[PDB]
Amino acid sequence: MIQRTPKIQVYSRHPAENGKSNFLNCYVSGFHPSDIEVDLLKNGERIEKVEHSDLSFSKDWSFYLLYYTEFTPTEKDEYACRVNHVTLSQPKIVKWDRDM
Amino acid sequence: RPQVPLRPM
Amino acid sequence: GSHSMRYFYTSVSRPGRGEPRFISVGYVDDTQFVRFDSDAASPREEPRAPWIEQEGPEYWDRNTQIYKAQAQTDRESLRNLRGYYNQSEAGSHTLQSMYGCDVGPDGRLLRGHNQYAYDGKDYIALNEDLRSWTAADTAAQITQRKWEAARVAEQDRAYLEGTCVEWLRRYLENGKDTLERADPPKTHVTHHPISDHEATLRCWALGFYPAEITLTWQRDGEDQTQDTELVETRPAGDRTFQKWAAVVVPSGEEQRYTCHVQHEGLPKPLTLRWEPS
């Protein structure tokens, strides 16, 4: 078919403040086909309570999904999103940068 | 509200 | 003050793993309001915005019956498409559909849509006339011939000009406090040295609805298109959107740069600069 690899952004709902509850988002978009694997990671380990938006797509037919979880950021905890898709030879890990 | 299906492709 | 209603259908075959999955979502503008998923335990149209919850049981039941019939139609379509392309029964394939209407502030139809893609490529589309089709290839020409014989376009036109517009107007009335409210972006500029020679200026827009926005950087009043990194607009999860635009500038030259923000919700467009504190 056409295959298109996902774009990935990892970010918070609100500006991060250490010790304050927030949501961690991983937005995957621009991909085709729709099957995709997305994990959110805290210090490298899979977070269990992760939900996602209902599958939809853009005007160019490419799919997008928001994966998200409640989290309370800290100075030292590291968060990331790990994505697998047929276009990738190995999963892609994108680290959360609170300034991006 | 959605449209009804009509004919397959 | 225009508005759109859209339905987005995705059917995906999965030989050896059951029948193709059918998913529908419905939107008004950038607000999702319904879903259906044939893999749910008890598939049913479900509300996804508060203002749709008031619809009575007849609404939900009829729409559920529509989506179940649509799943069956899309499965026939998928089998036909595989044959039109001489494809193996072993592979997975995707059929996407999009349809709906645009209206102006007066509630009058601006245009309708009803179109399809197979494996991510445009396949057939109802033309703007709501009467004729554009087919991508010799396979879609088969579908076009069949749909012309069955007078499909007439039925799609009737829905687009009637039901679609009428129900979009109802939803706009019932969801007015959100669907007809533009939330302007909250904006700022950050500064981050990358070396002794250069720094990044990043212009942020947060908390806005709808998603459409323009963020640009100018150097001496000239747009810096080639030199601006611009992320896709992204959902916050609270109905609002976020976006940033960044440029790398020579140290000491930051005051030559302005960020310009355009959005529905603003009384006037903003011009921002880095404000060192």
CATH superfamily of the largest domain in chain C: MHC class I-like antigen recognition-like
Task: Tell me the fraction of residues in β-strands of chain C, as a range.
Answer: 35-45%
Shape of chain B: rod-shaped
The number of helices of chain B is 0
Which protein chains make the most extensive interface, counting residues with beta carbons within 8 Å of the other chain's beta carbons? A-C, 31 and 33 residues
Strand content of chain B: under 5%
Structural class, from secondary structure content of chain C? alpha+beta
CATH-level-2 architecture of the largest domain in chain C: 2-Layer Sandwich
Oligomer: heterotrimer
The total strand number of chain B stands at: 0
How far is the N terminus from the C terminus of chain B? 22 Å
Total discrete domains of chain C: 2
Count of alpha/pi helices of chain C: 4
Ends distance of chain C = 39 Å
Organism (chain C): Homo sapiens
Binding site for a peptide antigen (chain C): 63, 84, 143, 146, 152, 159, 171
Subcellular location (chain C): Cell membrane; Endoplasmic reticulum membrane
Motif (Bw6 motif) (chain C): 77-83
Notable features of this structure?
heterotrimer, A: 100 residues, mainly beta, Immunoglobulin-like, five-stranded antiparallel sheet, four-stranded antiparallel sheet, 9 strands, 0% helix, 47% strand, elongated, B: 9 residues, little secondary structure, 0% strand, rod-shaped
